[PDB]
Design a protein around this motif. Structure first.
Motif, PDB file in Angstrom:
ATOM      1  N   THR A  23      -2.631 -33.099  29.998  1.00 42.62           N
ATOM      2  CA  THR A  23      -1.354 -32.897  30.670  1.00 42.62           C
ATOM      3  C   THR A  23      -1.584 -32.050  31.903  1.00 42.62           C
ATOM      4  O   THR A  23      -0.702 -31.300  32.290  1.00 42.62           O
ATOM      5  N   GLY A  60       2.538 -30.154  32.314  1.00 45.18           N
ATOM      6  CA  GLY A  60       2.832 -29.674  30.967  1.00 45.18           C
ATOM      7  C   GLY A  60       4.323 -29.523  30.793  1.00 45.18           C
ATOM      8  O   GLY A  60       5.038 -30.021  31.648  1.00 45.18           O
ATOM      9  N   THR A  61       4.763 -28.831  29.710  1.00 47.89           N
ATOM     10  CA  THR A  61       6.168 -28.445  29.531  1.00 47.89           C
ATOM     11  C   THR A  61       7.151 -29.599  29.637  1.00 47.89           C
ATOM     12  O   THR A  61       7.679 -30.037  28.623  1.00 47.89           O
ATOM     13  N   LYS A  62       7.400 -30.082  30.877  1.00 45.87           N
ATOM     14  CA  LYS A  62       8.299 -31.212  31.118  1.00 45.87           C
ATOM     15  C   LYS A  62       7.376 -32.366  31.424  1.00 45.87           C
ATOM     16  O   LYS A  62       7.486 -33.015  32.452  1.00 45.87           O
ATOM     17  N   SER A  63       6.432 -32.617  30.486  1.00 40.50           N
ATOM     18  CA  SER A  63       5.460 -33.687  30.670  1.00 40.50           C
ATOM     19  C   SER A  63       6.185 -34.981  30.403  1.00 40.50           C
ATOM     20  O   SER A  63       6.114 -35.880  31.223  1.00 40.50           O
TER      21      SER A  63
END
Length: 78
Positions: A23, A60-63
């Motif tokens: 990611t 990442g996170t809001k992948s």
């Protein structure tokens, strides 16, 4: 623009160095004359950092959200 935004830097296959990963991607180059990283960071990835010498990208996170936008592009340009 989103289906051409990712293209604006990740689709510049000419790129000299790129650290694609689970990611996390990266795009260490000098084609910054007019690159749209400012868009490719919140729209192509989920946070990037620019460091004269190299560039780093993080999806990442809001992948899932960003990857969902990626999915839209191939479906919009299939």
């Amino acid at each position: 623009m989103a289906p051409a935004l990712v293209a604006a830097f990740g689709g510049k296959e000419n790129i000299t160095n790129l650290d694609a990963c689970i990611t996390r991607l990266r795009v260490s180059v000098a084609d910054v004359s007019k690159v749209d990283q400012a868009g490719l960071k919140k729209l192509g990835a989920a946070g990037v950092v620019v460091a004269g010498s190299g560039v780093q990208a993080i999806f990442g996170t809001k992948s899932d959200n960003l990857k969902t936008e990626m999915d839209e592009y191939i479906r919009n340009f299939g």
